[PDB]
Nucleic acid binder design. Structure first.
Ligand SMILES: [Mg+2]
Ligand SMILES: [Mg+2]
Ligand SMILES: [Mg+2]
Ligand SMILES: [Mg+2]
Ligand SMILES: [Mg+2]
Ligand SMILES: [Mg+2]
Ligand SMILES: [Mg+2]
Ligand SMILES: [Mg+2]
Ligand SMILES: [Mg+2]
Ligand SMILES: [Mg+2]
Ligand SMILES: [Mg+2]
Ligand SMILES: [Mg+2]
Ligand SMILES: [Mg+2]
Ligand SMILES: [Mg+2]
Ligand SMILES: [Mg+2]
Ligand SMILES: [Mg+2]
Ligand SMILES: [Mg+2]
Lengths: 125, 154, 86, 45, 233, 34, 58, 203
RNA sequence: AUAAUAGUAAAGAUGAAAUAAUAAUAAUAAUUAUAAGACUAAUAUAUGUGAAAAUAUUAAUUAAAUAUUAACUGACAUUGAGGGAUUAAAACUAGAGUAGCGAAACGGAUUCGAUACCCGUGUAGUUCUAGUAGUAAACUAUGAAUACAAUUAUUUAUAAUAUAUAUAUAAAUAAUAAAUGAAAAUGAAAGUAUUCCACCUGAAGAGUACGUUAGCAAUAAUGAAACUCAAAACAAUAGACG
């Protein structure tokens, strides 16, 4: 089951912002692969400012680093990945959402589909 | 079947009401017989086999390949701003099916209410089924057939 | 069962297909093995939905009950198909 | 299977087209007539 | 609206009156109406051909009439959903008249927008009187236009000089163009001749246009000044 | 039922409810032990 | 009957062909897909360390 | 048959369209077939359409979309300005030639694009036009400056030696009032069907 | 709601006023900072979806769902007494929860009076979890199913057309024809017909009493008679009236 992810990570360090994001991406990707899963794409997005001053437990955030991870897994695995994301202090907002494979097998991320490229083959070419 | 017969009668009445010329009916044996009887008495202008889409010009043999799409086209009849086939009330309804002996049919013909049937009228036609063959009630009397009083057209 | 696949696939057939593709490419290893593993993971039952598993069970039931290969509406096969869903 | 289906039909259509030919074909073999022709065609293929 | 009995049964109603003695004298119309009876048979009559095309309305293509394989290679062995539905409304609803020429007309005016600006009289002269041999484009009663082209194309198609429709159309277009060029040259040279021999035209077309624009501009100016004044206040 | 007709029914229902409220202690006495 | 059998089988065959095509496409893609740790690390490096093609709109 | 006659006949000849009669966008060529009457036929309100047309219309020309609508009125507009633009263009006598090196389309599945010009000019470029005074080298045409210049039913790009201040700056945005003379250099025609004229202001 | 900041005499309320956990113990307004419950702005048309109750912040899981084709089954269907399951709001029994709202109660107004309408405190309740109960203007005041009948305009989906055209289908929604109807009006049903179930037979008395069953209970279902009238009811009409 192809699940897209959107995590808005924390950026504490000013000079080197992407490090925490990169670590998060590594860890969640590691979890996925240990657990019968297959990460397809890890689309980065920019250091984008949040719409409002969004706050985690005993913290506050105005800017964050955004990224999509487009992975396959079981439902239980995914649910648990989501839970771990919710638990951790270095992400502000997390959101897993299903990508339906009833018609196709190759499906790109939501952003790529919006641009034009339906399958990841198109992106490759 | 008798429900089918009632439905076709209702359809005929509807078509008479709005003045359509040429009308489809389901393609069964009983239904065909009924249509033929109407034609011979003089209520229908035409009677011809055909498709669900229209009446057939040439002969087309009916098989399992066709049968579901097959249909019985029937011409209706009008004169001096009045339809010929005004009514098609049936008598033997599916729930209370009535089967008269020859004497009862004779009585009906001669102006006697029987089994709550209004006795048959001047320009009317009571059809009668007798051994899977629809006839006029007068014809049935002549032949002496105890039969199911099917329906009534006026 | 352990190497059962969703989407109307069969593991033996998939491997053969992959081998044929490899042969075609050669005509015209570790990485290839990793790709094959990824494919299997994608098409596995245990990562897929329950719906696919049910469909497979229904198909199996049909195969068991069918009084000939063409028939799918056999009162017995219909009952069998109902049972899996139930 | 598709080729078999085609062959039976095409032969039948040819038989329908030519009446003189049809009778000769029937003799060589050994609505009713059409059915017999069809049966012969099936036997052949 | 219900079918009125009383508009067509007039003579019967009067005949009854005459019989009674309510009417002493017969009307002038009475004998005439007796001689020429009304229709009084207000039926919905079915139609089996489209007159424009010549397509058959009533018939249904059977499973036995379609022996060969379909697109996507499936043999029709059953009636479909639409083949079971009783298509009686098609017999009664009047046919949409279609012509091959309409498409050609549409194409022509897409290709030649400024042919639309050539004014068209639609008030017909005797349609029976005409007799055009479409061997050529220039007919006498008819002017030169896209219609004439299209008629020429149709003639070519009929005669099978050009078996293809497109080629015939192109040919007709090319015939038209030469004629148009000739027409254009005629007018210009006639104008030149007129200029040479001391003819005097009081108002040229462009001058007329300028004059027309001028009045509108004058109207605009006074209004615009008033609007500016209003805006200021 | 029009609204006017309903209003008689409503009134009746109210009266009944009142009677039930009145005869609560009496009803209780009647119910228990017999 | 023969025609009906053909119709049944042809559609199944087509579906099978489609499934095979889809599988082939997946296989073609799958060099980009990740299962092992090293591959994942490489992907991460490509994404983050390069500092290029961050999906941001303007 | 009747059907054949109908197909031939003058209403079938008018190619149907449901384009707006009011189009406030850019108009590069005629949208609708102009339809004239004779004066006699106008006098008894007959245009060769389904219905009579209102006696309020006194112009002989019009444009229409529907013979009859649900509103029980023919959708028309009483105007045939496009013919006059064409006639003005003809009078100006500047022959349209493709600025791109291509053969003239009138000489030698379907292409809906405009074949050369749309038929506003079937004139050929090689001719001169003599007069009593002589052979006309420069085509003199009166037009109006807008701010571009309106020259005989066409807007045209303009060029000059020096920008005249006395005429322009005296009435900055009322330049449309005063008609100026123009020397039309050439007329090119683009893919969209717009006639791109080029004029020169004379003083 | 609590706390801090700075700041000054009113604040809050109403038709106008007061009473109050309001305010010279320093409020209200403002800016911050914590917590708590409960609700879900636009999109929205309840369009649609659901058997009906219902159902619009997001996501995931599991379940069910549309159309057209292909193949198969071969009348296996319809309706459905009894029966079964679900069934708004209020109510009740436990155990949490309780911001706002708010029966009751108390207080202030209003008023001749004011057990009210308005204002203030505000308990049950409203919220969740597990149940009970099985009623509502639970309404489209219209039981379910099938065959059929004249038009138009709107959308929605399907197919072909040579992706954007004008076409053929269905589906819904809105105007109608006919037909029906006490009329209002219904309009593919309140039409033409067939099938099956539920229910009605003047008004009061009465969905009351007695009885029985079920419920923790409130109650729910079942459901009479005497007594008394020539009444009682609906659609529409024309007034008078507001
Ligand atoms: Mg009632
Ligand atoms: Mg219902
Ligand atoms: Mg909302
Ligand atoms: Mg039922
Ligand atoms: Mg509600
Ligand atoms: Mg409650
Ligand atoms: Mg409680
Ligand atoms: Mg209160
Ligand atoms: Mg319950
Ligand atoms: Mg109750
Ligand atoms: Mg009730
Ligand atoms: Mg409700
Ligand atoms: Mg009426
Ligand atoms: Mg009735
Ligand atoms: Mg209505
Ligand atoms: Mg009793
Ligand atoms: Mg009770």
């Amino acid at each position: 089951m192809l699940y897209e992810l959107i995590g808005l990570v924390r950026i504490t360090n000013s000079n080197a912002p992407k490090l925490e994001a990169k670590e998060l991406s590594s860890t969640i990707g590691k979890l996925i692969i240990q657990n019968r899963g297959v990460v397809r794409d890890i689309v980065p997005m920019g250091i984008r400012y949040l719409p409002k001053i969004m706050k985690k437990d005993q913290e506050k955030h105005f800017r964050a680093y955004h990224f999509l991870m487009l992975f396959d897994s079981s439902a239980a695995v995914q649910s648990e990945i989501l839970r771990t994301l919710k638990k951790d202090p270095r992400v502000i907002r997390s959101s897993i959402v299903k990508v339906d494979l009833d018609k196709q097998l190759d499906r790109a991320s939501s952003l790529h589909r919006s641009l034009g490229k339906k399958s990841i083959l198109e992106l490759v070419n | 079947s008798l429900v089918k017969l009632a439905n076709t009668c209702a359809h005929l009445q509807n078509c008479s009401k709005v003045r359509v010329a040429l009308t489809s009916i389901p393609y069964t044996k009983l239904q065909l017989q009924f249509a033929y009887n109407l034609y011979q008495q003089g209520f229908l202008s035409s009677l011809q086999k055909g498709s669900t889409m229209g009446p057939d010009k040439d002969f087309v043999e009916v098989t399992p390949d066709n049968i579901s799409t097959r249909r019985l086209w029937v011409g209706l009849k009008y004169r001096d701003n009045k339809p010929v086939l005004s009514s098609c009330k049936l008598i033997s309804k599916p729930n209370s099916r009535i089967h008269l002996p020859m004497e009862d049919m004779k009585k009906l013909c001669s102006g006697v209410t029987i089994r709550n049937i209004k006795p048959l009228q001047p320009g009317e036609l009571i059809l009668v089924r007798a051994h899977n063959n629809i006839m006029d009630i007068n014809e049935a009397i002549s032949k002496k057939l105890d039969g199911e009083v099917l329906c009534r057209v006026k | 069962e352990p190497l059962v696949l969703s989407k109307g696939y069969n593991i033996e057939e998939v491997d053969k297909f992959l081998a044929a593709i490899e042969s075609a490419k050669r005509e015209r290893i570790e990485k290839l093995e990793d790709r094959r593993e990824a494919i299997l993971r994608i098409l596995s039952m245990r990562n897929s939905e329950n719906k696919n598993a049910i469909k497979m069970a229904v198909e199996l039931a049909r195969k068991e009950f069918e009084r000939f290969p063409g028939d799918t509406g056999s009162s017995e096969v219909q009952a069998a198909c109902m049972t899996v869903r139930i | 299977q598709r080729s078999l289906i085609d062959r039976i039909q095409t032969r039948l259509s040819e038989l329908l087209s030519n009446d003189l030919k049809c009778d000769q074909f029937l003799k060589d073999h050994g609505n009713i007539k059409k059915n017999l022709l069809r049966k012969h065609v099936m036997m052949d293929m | 609206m219900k079918i009125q009995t009383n508009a067509v049964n007039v003579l019967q109603r009067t005949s009854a009156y005459l019989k009674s003695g309510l009417l002493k004298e017969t009307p002038a119309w009475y004998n005439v109406v007796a001689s020429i009876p009304p229709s009084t048979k207000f039926t919905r009559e079915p139609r089996f051909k489209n007159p424009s095309n010549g397509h058959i309305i009533g018939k249904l293509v059977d499973v036995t009439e379609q022996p060969h394989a379909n697109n996507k290679g499936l043999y029709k062995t059953r009636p479909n959903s639409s083949d079971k539905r009783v298509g009686v409304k098609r017999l009664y609803r009047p046919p949409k008249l279609t012509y091959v020429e309409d498409r050609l007309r549409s194409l022509f005016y897409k290709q030649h927008p400024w042919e639309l600006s050539r004014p068209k009289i639609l008030v017909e002269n005797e349609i029976g009187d005409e007799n055009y041999d479409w061997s050529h484009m220039l007919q006498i009663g008819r002017p030169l236009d896209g219609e004439s082209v299209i008629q020429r194309t149709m003639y070519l198609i009929k005669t099978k000089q050009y078996g293809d429709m497109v080629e015939a159309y192109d040919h007709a277009r090319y015939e038209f163009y030469a004629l148009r060029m000739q027409e254009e040259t005629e007018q210009q040279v006639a104008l030149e001749e007129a200029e040479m021999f001391g003819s005097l035209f009081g108002v040229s077309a462009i001058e007329h246009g300028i004059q027309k624009e001028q009045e509108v501009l004058d109207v605009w100016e006074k209004k615009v000044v008033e609007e500016t004044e209003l805006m200021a206040a | 039922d029009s609204v006017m007709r309903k209003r008689k029914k409503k009134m009746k229902k109210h009266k009944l409810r009142k009677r039930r409220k009145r005869e609560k202690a009496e009803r209780r006495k009647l119910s228990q032990g017999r | 009957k023969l025609k009906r059998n053909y119709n049944r089988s042809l559609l199944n065959f087509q579906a099978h062909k489609k499934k095979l095509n889809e599988l082939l496409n997946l296989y073609h893609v799958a060099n980009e897909f990740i299962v092992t740790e090293s591959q994942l690390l490489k992907k991460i490096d490509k994404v983050f360390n390069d500092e290029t093609e961050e999906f941001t709109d303007a | 048959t009747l059907a054949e006659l109908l197909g031939r006949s003058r209403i079938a000849q008018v190619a149907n369209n449901h384009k707006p009669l009011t189009y406030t966008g850019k108009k590069f060529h005629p949208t609708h077939q102009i339809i004239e009457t004779k004066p006699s036929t106008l006098y008894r309100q007959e245009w060769g359409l389904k219905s009579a047309i209102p006696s309020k219309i006194k112009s002989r020309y019009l444009v229409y979309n529907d013979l009859d609508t649900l509103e029980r009125i023919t959708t028309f507009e009483p105007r045939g300005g496009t013919q006059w633009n064409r006639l003005r263009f003809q009078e100006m006598g500047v022959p349209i030639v493709s600025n791109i090196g291509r053969q003239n389309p009138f000489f030698k599945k379907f292409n809906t694009e405009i074949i050369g010009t749309g038929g506003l000019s079937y004139s050929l470029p090689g001719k001169l036009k003599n007069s009593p005074n002589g052979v006309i080298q420069r085509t003199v045409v009166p037009g109006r400056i807008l701010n571009l210049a309106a020259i005989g039913g066409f807007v045209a790009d303009v060029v000059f030696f020096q920008s005249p201040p006395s005429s322009f700056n005296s009435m900055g945005d009322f330049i449309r009032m005063k008609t100026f003379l123009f020397e039309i250099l050439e007329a090119s025609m683009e893919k969209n069907g717009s006639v791109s004229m080029h004029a020169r202001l004379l003083e």
